Amino acid sequence: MLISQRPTLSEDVLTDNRSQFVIEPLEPGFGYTLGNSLRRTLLSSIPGAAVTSIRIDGVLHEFTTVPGVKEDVTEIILNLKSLVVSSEEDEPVTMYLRKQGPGEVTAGDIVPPAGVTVHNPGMHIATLNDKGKLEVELVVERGRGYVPAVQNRASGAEIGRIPVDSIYSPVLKVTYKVDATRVEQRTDFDKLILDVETKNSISPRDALASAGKTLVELFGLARELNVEAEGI
Amino acid sequence: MLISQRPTLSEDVLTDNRSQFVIEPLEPGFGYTLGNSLRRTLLSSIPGAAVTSIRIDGVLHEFTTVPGVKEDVTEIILNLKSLVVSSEEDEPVTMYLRKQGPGEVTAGDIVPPAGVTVHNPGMHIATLNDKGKLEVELVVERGRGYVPAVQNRASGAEIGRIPVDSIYSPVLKVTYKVDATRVEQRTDFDKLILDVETKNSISPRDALASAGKTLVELFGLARELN
Amino acid sequence: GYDTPLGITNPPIDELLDRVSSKYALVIYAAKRARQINDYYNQLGEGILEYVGPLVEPGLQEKPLSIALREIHADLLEHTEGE
Amino acid sequence: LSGLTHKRRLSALGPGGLSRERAGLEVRDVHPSHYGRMCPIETPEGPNIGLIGSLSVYARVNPFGFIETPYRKVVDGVVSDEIVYLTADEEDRHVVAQANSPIDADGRFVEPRVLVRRKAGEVEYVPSSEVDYMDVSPRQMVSVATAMIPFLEHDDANRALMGANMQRQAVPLVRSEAPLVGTGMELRAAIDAGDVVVAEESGVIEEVSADYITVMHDNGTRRTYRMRKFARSNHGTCANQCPIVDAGDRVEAGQVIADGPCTDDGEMALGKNLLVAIMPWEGHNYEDAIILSNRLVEEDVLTSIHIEEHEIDARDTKLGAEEITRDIPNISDEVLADLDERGIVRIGAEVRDGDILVGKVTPKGETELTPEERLLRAIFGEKAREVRDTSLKVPHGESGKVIGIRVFSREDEDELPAGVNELVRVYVAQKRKISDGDKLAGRHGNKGVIGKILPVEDMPFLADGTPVDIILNTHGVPRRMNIGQILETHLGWCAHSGWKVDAAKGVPDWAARLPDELLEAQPNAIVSTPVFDGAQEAELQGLLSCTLPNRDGDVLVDADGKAMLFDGRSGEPFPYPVTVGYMYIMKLHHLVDDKIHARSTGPYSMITQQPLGGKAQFGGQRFGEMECWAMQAYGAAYTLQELLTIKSDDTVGRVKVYEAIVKGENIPEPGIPESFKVLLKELQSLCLNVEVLSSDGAAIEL
Amino acid sequence: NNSVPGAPNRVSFAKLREPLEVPGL
Amino acid sequence: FQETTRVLTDAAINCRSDKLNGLKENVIIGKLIPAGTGINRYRNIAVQP
Amino acid sequence: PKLMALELFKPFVMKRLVDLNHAQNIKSAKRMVERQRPQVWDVLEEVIAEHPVLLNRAPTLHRLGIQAFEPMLVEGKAIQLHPLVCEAFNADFDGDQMAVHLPLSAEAQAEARILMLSSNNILSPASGRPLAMPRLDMVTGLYYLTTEVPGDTGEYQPASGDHPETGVYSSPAEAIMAADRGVLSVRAKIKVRLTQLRPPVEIEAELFGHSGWQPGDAWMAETTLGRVMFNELLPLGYPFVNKQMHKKVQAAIINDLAERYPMIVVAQTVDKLKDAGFYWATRSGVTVSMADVLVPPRKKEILDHYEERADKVEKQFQRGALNHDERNEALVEIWKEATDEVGQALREHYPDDNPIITIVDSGATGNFTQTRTLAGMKGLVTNPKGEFIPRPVKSSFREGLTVLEYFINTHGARKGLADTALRTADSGYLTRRLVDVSQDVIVREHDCQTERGIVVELAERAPDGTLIRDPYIETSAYARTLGTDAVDEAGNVIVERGQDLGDPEIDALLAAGITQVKVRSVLTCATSTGVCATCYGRSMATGKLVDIGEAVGIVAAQSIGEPGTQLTMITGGLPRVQELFEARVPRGKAPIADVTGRVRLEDGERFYKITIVPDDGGEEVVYDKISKRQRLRVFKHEDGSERVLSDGDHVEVGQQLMEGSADPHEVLRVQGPREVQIHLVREVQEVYRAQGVSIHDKHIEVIVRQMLRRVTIIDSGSTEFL
Ligand SMILES: [Mg+2]
Ligand SMILES: [Zn+2]
């Protein structure tokens, strides 16, 4: 068959990180069929890397606060969770952050091993008073989607291992809508409006490209089941 | 911890018309959306063939009767609406139905031309007495979706034409269920079980393949987005 | 601070009222200018250019009243109130 | 049903009776003497409330004119089979029992004290011996229309009134289907309505055809029943009669042979059965709106047939005789391609809005042509053709085939009104499919309008892939207090899916009173719940837990009656289960096609010069006084000056503004309304010197 | 108890027996 | 409002004259109501660029 | 519908079609429009780009009955309407029809685009409260979204030994992602870190030291993901709201936004709230089924006990001691008590998750009496004569009424349906007469520079408590201009003279302890014709000082007449209002203290005879009151209504003694115009507020000013007037 009007995508920019993608026109009823699948694929298909667990030698557990730091241990965990990491090694590598004396510690001061890199060196992690120190042994692993820490609760046996909810995704927020379009007297064509906001590890354009890659690869399995023709 | 194995599709057969497709492993929380997308594209974008218009000898419009039959023209039109036919030709072809004498007229009495066939010869169309006969000429076209009968209103054809609503859809019922394997281990995935039932015009595999090709073509715009 | 208005709600009513004493004055302040613009369009073919046309460059087929409201919002007109 | 109820009406106004204004409000109320004679529920909703009722089911009119009701008299505490009819006074002077009062199989009142009805609105327990009379059935106080509302005992009085009134507005569809849940009054109402042909004497059918049926009686005499088909009703709907018998079948006397409109196998069927899911859905069913699956539109489930009717006559005139002819003055041949030689549209020819339906020419007198018109006549060789054009044309908003044409001519010795020679009427039939704006309503008085018609792929679907055919909001059920609809839905689902009450261990406690034949049912079975005596809640609770599984071997609805639906758009299951079940849905006659009305500029009245015109060219709306106070309160003054002068009454301002809009210039200033000049010219005729004046006191001219 | 010969069979939740049939409506 | 014939007779007797300064009278005659945008304070506005 | 727009815009569309050269002249264009060729739809869409039309729902009943919506082409044959404005139109989408007009001239177009636009009418003119707000279905969605439930999935937990606290999320994005995965219920206790939502003043003044929050500043919140999602809808800069969104809370939020932000922002946020509520109502799991309407568990025992008591009373009557009246009174009281007890038990039994209780409690619609009738006991029902029948109905609409109970119940439904038409007719007549009297009143001046101003009590100070806000400050003094500066105990001025009152100024005055404040009012205006803007005060729909030339009399009449439809029943219903405004002799005609003094009353069993000895001196005024009525509270220091009229006490002049309504003429004669105006305003406000509706006082002061504007002359002397 053939498509009456070929859909086209026009990128709009609202911010260096944000974006608004409009696919128009679409046959009636295809709006949601496209948008929901694309949103889910974007959210939970693109591989990425993030901190999985952390260590604090200065504290025996997490109930109290690490000495010499104003922020609570939970606040430290939260600040370090948002840290952006790009990795190219499959195995989980370890990282070390050590500082001494009064001042503030930033993500840029952490020494990264080979492969792994940090895209926001200027991020603030914590602050140290006079004669203050903190040594943290955080592991970085690659993955996809979002995985809580409770499912990561069972991980060997260690002294101060603190699993943290890791975000294995370079895209962190996606929204979509649908609006009517007037291409003919039908006046019922859909106009998807996909809004995607990603981290600094991938541009929204590349994120959408990778999501389309994954989804087309997946639907190829259904397509190859038989030979039958359709439209554009 | 990327999943090494990509999804695979395997077909199971429960009945000549019904089949189950298992697709797994899939990323967590993703089976539902994929299944619903496949269902939505299956119920509205599967091309098929169906009767578009009829022409009964001695009948000017659909609000009348032809002598010898047990039911008016509207009833026979409604009965024909359920008829299922598959056409290979990409042009409007004509089909003939000639029955006379006492008895019952069924869809098997039709004489389709080359490239067309009737998949339910056991259907009941009307009942005839020895007094009257029945001669019907009907057109079969190929399309997708649902075209209101008004399509032939503006064609300006002869008064004999009786436009009929068209329903180009072989798929009948589609259902899916997801069996999530949520475990404490990171090896968490969900398995999809897609149930599809067709009107016997085409096998379920053909419908699924057509839906998959439609979706691949539609999503190729994101591919060229790059 | 808001999303960009769309439709007959642009320009925002509050900004328009910031210029005129009250909405009852604003309706006339806009309608008279709309009439002036319509007269200018009518006499565009030939005539004395006594009625100056729109000040702000109009859009693709923008109604005269919309042009009047936009040019009022742009602070290009001055009006005198009777009594 | 509508015709039967109309024949059964009890008017209280008209000649020889009260008038609306003079009559007080005390006569519109119910009286304790209405029990069994006049239905207290059924009544018009408009101002004529209480002045129009309906005979109860068992009520009869005594020769003097007083309405009687049946009763079975108790002699010594034992109910007697024989019955007697008592009027109002006799009922007052005696003691009347209650039908629901338990009675032993031997006629002995188990309860020593039984609820009783006394002289006037007094009910009190009385020994089981003093009681003198007993009712016949619990449905004695309801009309025929109200007797076919399942679970009427649960709805409120106003809701039941609304449902009963709406049951009389249903539009006969193309393929009627009998209700799954309905009282026993369906069949008797259908049979006595007179719209179903019933064999007069037992016989054997020789040959049956759509047009006619011939039955051979047992005495050797043959009879033929002619069934009218596609005959216009009195209100635009179509009447059809399809035989439901087969050749070589012995039909017993009194058996239904064919079904008229709204009848499936000889029982009233005003609507179809739709799968209902009660939940709010994205606001499209907000505040009484209804969402329908496109499956209904594409399956002709709610397709209706309507037959219009137009007619023109050729009446002789002093100036000549009008004659219908194919030739029409100064019209193209393409427009006149459908007319036949006689000058009428050919049967079966689709006719659109504004098309010519029958061509006639009327005699002309003398009227000098306008300069350019006369010149154009001269140039083209087109003679003056004095005869004008008055050909009947399809009014605005009509379409469809031309099923039949009837022509009466005075030449053929036909009775026509004096001064007429040729009268022809053309019937236009239109097939209407349900769309936005059409009204739907169940039997429980819950109206609605089709807010949206979603594609079959978007509607929520059961766990097995069966999309729901309609969604109803849940915020309107408890507020309106018509809980009967939910019980009807549950019973409908139980009937459709079929149930098999467990009996290996014995009949459960909740099934003790169920009829022995009602413990097992087949899928898509038929069930009935007579009004005021029917399935109690315990019965439904037991049935819902014993429904048969689907062909796939799974049960959809849980014990509570709710099911886990799947969203059609998102694709993910809804967080909580939702109610589902088959509910009987009718199609009201308040269709959107007739209501749509528009008027930019048309004809005008004569005395008042205000906008006016038959609904062929549509008339303007009514800008009353409250609509003027609303405008004044806004401070809006120019809009009010316009709506009353420039587009309502100004004779010259109207023309000037129409020219100005059809030209590039501005809209001119309105003048003085003709409704004020007329007022002054009439007030002057009363010998009252009315003269408008300025500050100087000088009289002014108007 | 269908009075008419060829009525469709629809069981009812009837717990009481009506001694008098509905008269000619 | 009420008693149209009596008020007409009384007005004729008294030869009473009324000012057209009310909303109802202006609505009847077709003049701008003396309210909102109809008052001369707003009706007579000169606007030029 | 395009079929209506084409036939309604015919001249504009035909002209534009001619200009595009699709037709050669007007005649061809008219023929083509009649035939409706495909070339007409494009031009028709082009010609209604910004042409507002007026939608009117007959019978228009108040000012907001006519709106001005921007047209949009749509298929079908029904006029699509916005969900929010249905409240203003009072329109139910169950077959209702509304006419649509069209303004032609440029003046009319601007007039319908500036004044009558629907976006500019969020606030109803009767009272300064929102009218186009989440009302019926979206309210339930928002209530479910913002609700908090304990022990849900993923709720915040404290540190337990080696296991750190779980439920702390970096940003709402991560919370949304986790909720999508399925490890966090939308409504559960969470500790998120927000960055684009201003913290509440309590947290802002502490974490930042009142330095002022800006986007990008992170603070720790303790709330539910649903609340965060909801607050994203409110305009940026609005303080975080962390409460369940009952209907009252939403009304307060909308009112505050309208009082602190431009109306465009209010319209945008209301639209967004409507969309979110509609979307989230579908997933609230609100349905109806027999498992959801639960019968009370111990209803049978209560019914048996009260039936036994009623039988005891019946036997007592059978002894002959009591007549019909006492028997009826006792039975009615017993069954009323039984119904109340059953309702309380049913309320206790039901949980907080049933859809019935969720709908009723959330304020979406309905009341608990309907739920009690549907699941508990319907109770005794009215009779055509109007008296309660001693026999109640012991079965609710769930169990199923019997024949007798249903027949008895039908009386009330028939009576109500009959009464609806008469009530609406009377309301229309009263509205007509009110518009009739107050046609003249229009704001003609900006300020009359008058000094007279009615003193209105702001909040009486309790003898023990520091202050108690008057229950009806929202209606008495909430938008009136301040006639005189309210000086505190010291020389400081809390509010300067002539500054319009409001929420912050009222709060400041209450804090300062000032109770009595003199507020300028329309009733004391010195303008010869009309009433200046200052005296009338802040408008309601506008939200700012009323602009000159704005009709106020018509608005006041519309506002007073609007609640007549729902104003249900010495009758205290609509007839009370009608007689109060007609200034007719009240039916009760309670006696009034003609002159202040000590009361020397003699109680006559047949006719009450009241006499008061003036304290200053004089004679005793004698009142011959009938003895069939009951005494009202005597004006005493205690002011306890239970007190009886004790003889020998001292009463203030003009104070009523018996139950009823004092004659307005007599109170005016004895006390003056001030107190009669106060009495009329208070009584009409009381009858309106008894039903629950609220209308600002100024809308009634406008009518009273026109009512009391004549001076009777007893002697002409040197004056021509008879
Ligand atoms: Mg309605
Ligand atoms: Zn003043």
Author numbering:
A (entry chain b): 1 to 232
B (entry chain a): 1 to 226
C (entry chain e): 28 to 110
D (entry chain c): 446 to 1147
E (entry chain c): 29 to 53
F (entry chain d): 1226 to 1274
G (entry chain d): 444 to 1012, 1024 to 1176
Paper text:
Here, using single-molecule Förster resonance energy transfer and cryo-electron microscopy, we explored the conformational landscape of RNAP from the human pathogen Mycobacterium tuberculosis upon binding to a single-stranded DNA (ssDNA) fragment that includes the −10 element sequence (−10 ssDNA). We found that like the transcription activator RNAP-binding protein A, −10 ssDNA induced σ subunit loading onto the DNA/RNA channels of RNAP.
Particles were distributed equally between two distinct RNAP conformations (43.4% of docked σR4 and 40.5% of undocked σR4). In the Mtb EσB bearing docked σR4, the overall σB path matched that of σB in the consensus I/II structures and that of σA in the published structures of Mtb RPo. Moreover, σR4 was inserted in the RNA exit channel and its residues σB-I247, L250, D316, Y321, and S323 contacted the β′-dock domain, residue σB-D278 contacted the β′-ZBD, and residues σB-A245 and V246 contacted the β-clamp. By plotting the distance ranges between σ-I247 and β′-I469 against the distances between β-G284 and clamp (β′-K123 and β′-L360), we found that σR4 adopted two distinct conformations with average distances of ∼7 Å (docked σR4) and ∼17 Å (undocked σR4).
